[PDB]
Nucleic acid binder design. Structure first.
Ligand SMILES: [Mg+2]
Ligand SMILES: [Mg+2]
Ligand SMILES: [Mg+2]
Ligand SMILES: [Mg+2]
Ligand SMILES: [Mg+2]
Ligand SMILES: [Mg+2]
Ligand SMILES: [Mg+2]
Ligand SMILES: [Mg+2]
Ligand SMILES: [Mg+2]
Ligand SMILES: [Mg+2]
Ligand SMILES: [Mg+2]
Ligand SMILES: [Mg+2]
Lengths: 95, 147, 207
RNA sequence: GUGAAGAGUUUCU
RNA sequence: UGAAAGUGAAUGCAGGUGGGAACGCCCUUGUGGCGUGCACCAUCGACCGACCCGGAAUGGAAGGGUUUGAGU
RNA sequence: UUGACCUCAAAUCAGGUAGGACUACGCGCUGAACUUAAGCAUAUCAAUAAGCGCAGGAAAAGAAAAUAACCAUGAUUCCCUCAGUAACGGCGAGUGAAGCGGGAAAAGCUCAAAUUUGAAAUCUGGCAACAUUUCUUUUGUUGUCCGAGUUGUAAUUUCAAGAAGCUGCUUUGAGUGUAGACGAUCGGUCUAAGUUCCUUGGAACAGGACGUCAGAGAGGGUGAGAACCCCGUCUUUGGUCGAUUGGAUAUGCCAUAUAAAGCGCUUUCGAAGAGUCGAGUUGUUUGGGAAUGCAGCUCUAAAUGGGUGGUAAAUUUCAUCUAA
């Protein structure tokens, strides 16, 4: 933190301090009640047809095909990788 | 004012200065600056070379504040300080040397044009040119960098 | 057509611009209206100050971060450290900014000092006239409408007029440091990617 | 949408 | 100045040469000689940026160039 | 057979409500061409004219799914600046924003997601009584009964938090008439002064002489240029009315005031909006450039997730915000 305007830790050096918790940044955390509700809903509702197709490709060890299908179904690759991991946990949960 | 205008002088002169042959028609070579590549080329190529075409990179969403860096030369450095400070240090021998914070005078870089008197001074700046720093050090002063 | 000396013309007057010409013949009228509104408001809220006290904050970007200006309102931490509840702050003319935070002790201490000076100059009238309560004042007789800027101005940061030149400063190389620091930031990524190749591809040497 | 045969974990007539 | 990342203006009396306003001095009555030389123009350099060089991980310091810039 | 519930009808049922007009300004939809490009199709004119829907005294916008990249800022709107700039463009003609900075004004909040469950604590309507009034024209209160409502009306909370428990703290809303004044104002006036003389003239309001007032010599009227003839102009109080706890000892008193908030240690917690976001594609639009906004269709989410960070992609960090 040299106190210059160039380099890695540039800028004026002041006395740093801990910013307080902003509860809005808690968003995205999984509450235990919400997890319970989602497990019940997953029991009542089944799996979407594309989810079954992806799980089948996962069960046949066609890992690239599952990734291509999940990305094609959901849009982005990032959502696909999260979905494939979630469906992989489901598959192993049944085993 | 209208009383001194050339229009007043042309009353009674039939063509109002615009000729009997060629006249003052509506736009006879087109509107605005249209035609720089075709019938206005001899003007554009003579008085505005470089007008047509592209040069260089685009930069999307330019924001000029991070680029802000007005400059001051060495020959103006002592003018940034009050008259009382100049009288106290300039030309004298003192244990302390004056501090010239160029940023609070509205400058981001100190450049090297000109010369300095032979008194020590501390120059606080975000940036400094190499030759500016050498001349400050020869005068016995120093550059201290700030943010 | 173009044949005269000077800049090639640029005038943006190809729409029906005369339809939307805005004149300023009401400029002195607006100025009088606004002054009269201020006078009307001042007499209505008296003896409260016409302007609420504001925090001092540093403007963003390198162009203005050397300056100081009024901000919107005091942070929750600043009000906490000055002993003012956020629900009470508004009732006595102290604005609350829930969005701004204190990333440094300097911002916090500067504004906590502004609040403390405000509270020390503040005369809170009792809710029921003639029955003073906690946090109120018992000398309300000399209460008048005063400017907050007269008591708590926004002050710019001062300077060191002069100081000794140390041997450390004399050995400092400002230009070389600026060049080196810029180069170090520039090639940090290549250095990091190199370090991966320095310690990972060598792992096969073990086996 | 719901059912039956056929084709070299599947969807085609 | 460069497309840009960037870098950023004194060898010297802030240079030399020629013409030159104004002023001063010598003649000796000429359209004179001598000394400073403003403005301006032409011209030889220096300095900053770009570019082209050799050139002893990162920086480009000294050395250069027929060049180049709406520069000093 | 009846009754309950659900769904669906009918009535000149009891009580309401909408339409039409005004369109300067305001919020949307739809949508040209003339024109400029010296022709012309993209472009421009123009997200304009015409067409259609919908408001108010303003409207819209608005308390960040915002900036930034700083020592950081902090709802919205408007002005100056940014800036004829970044950018778009048969890169032609042309077009063209934003963050910071200064200023005007400033104000902050409400829900849905929670078990009140030792008590639907909530609401509308009818009827009756009692008050109230810009007002017999207005606006409520209580009681009672019936409806609504558990397929959820109230109460604590809305992420800035917060709730439940551990432990320690102080205590507040309404009528009468004074003075100070203040909105419509007034029996509306204390508010000043030449209509003397001479000449001209039909007429003096003209010229002359002699005076006057002036906080009034603005303007208008009157038989011609009138401060003093008339209305006014200028200056300055006293009769009402109503808002009249708005301020004061707001006194003098109503009797609001017995149970609700503030911080304070410790915990375990902390529900947070879906055919939506996002992706593709088509059309349109924008300064927005391998999509700025909008819309159709296809696919269609998640939980430290999700959005943004102005060059498409994969990965890893960081910052910032918290949509539907
Ligand atoms: Mg003619
Ligand atoms: Mg001809
Ligand atoms: Mg044409
Ligand atoms: Mg034509
Ligand atoms: Mg034609
Ligand atoms: Mg129209
Ligand atoms: Mg109306
Ligand atoms: Mg509104
Ligand atoms: Mg919020
Ligand atoms: Mg346009
Ligand atoms: Mg939300
Ligand atoms: Mg359209």
């Amino acid at each position: 933190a040299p106190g210059l305007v160039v380099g890695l830790n540039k800028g004026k050096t002041l006395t740093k301090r801990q910013l307080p918790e902003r509860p809005s940044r808690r968003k995205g955390h999984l509450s235990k009640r919400t997890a319970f509700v989602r497990s019940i809903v997953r029991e009542v509702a089944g799996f979407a047809p594309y989810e079954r197709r992806v799980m089948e490709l996962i069960r046949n060890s066609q890992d690239k095909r599952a990734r291509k299908l999940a990305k094609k179904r959901l849009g982005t690759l990032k959502r696909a990788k999260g979905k494939i991991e979630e469906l992989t946990s489901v598959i192993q949960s049944s085993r | 004012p209208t009383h001194t205008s050339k229009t007043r002088k042309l009353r009674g002169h039939v063509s109002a200065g615009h000729g009997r042959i060629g006249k003052h028609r509506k736009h006879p070579g087109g509107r605005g600056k249209a035609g720089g590549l075709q019938h206005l080329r001899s003007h554009f190529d003579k008085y505005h070379p470089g007008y047509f075409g592209k040069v260089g990179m685009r930069r999307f969403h330019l924001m000029k504040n991070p680029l802000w860096r007005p400059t001051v030369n060495l020959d103006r450095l002592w003018t940034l300080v009050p008259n009382e400070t100049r009288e106290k240090y300039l030309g004298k021998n003192t244990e302390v040397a004056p501090v010239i914070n160029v940023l609070q005078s509205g400058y981001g870089k100190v450049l090297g044009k000109g010369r300095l008197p032979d008194t020590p001074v501390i120059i606080q700046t975000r940036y400094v040119s190499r030759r500016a720093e050498e001349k400050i050090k020869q005068a016995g002063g120093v550059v201290e960098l700030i943010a | 057509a173009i044949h005269v000396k000077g800049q090639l013309p640029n005038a943006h007057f190809h729409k029906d611009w005369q339809r939307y010409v805005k004149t300023w013949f009401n400029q002195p009228g607006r100025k009088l209206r606004r002054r009269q509104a201020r006078q009307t408001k001042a007499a209505k809220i008296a003896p409260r100050p016409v302007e609420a006290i504001r925090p001092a904050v540093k403007p963003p970007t390198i162009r203005y971060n050397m300056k100081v200006r009024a901000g919107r309102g005091f942070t929750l931490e600043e009000l906490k450290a000055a002993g003012v509840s956020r629900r009470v702050a508004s009732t006595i003319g102290i604005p609350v900014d829930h969005r701004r935070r204190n990333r440094s002790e300097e911002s916090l201490q500067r504004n906590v000092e502004r609040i403390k000076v405000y509270l020390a100059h503040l005369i809170v009238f009792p809710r029921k006239a003639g029955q003073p309560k906690k946090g109120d004042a018992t000398d309300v007789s000399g209460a008048e409408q005063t400017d907050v800027a007269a008591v708590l101005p926004i002050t710019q940061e001062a300077v060191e007029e002069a100081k000794p030149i140390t041997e450390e400063a004399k050995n400092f190389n400002a230009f070389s440091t600026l060049s080196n620091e810029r180069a170090y930031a520039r090639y940090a990524g290549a250095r990091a990617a190199f370090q991966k190749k320095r310690a990972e591809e060598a792992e096969a040497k073990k086996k």
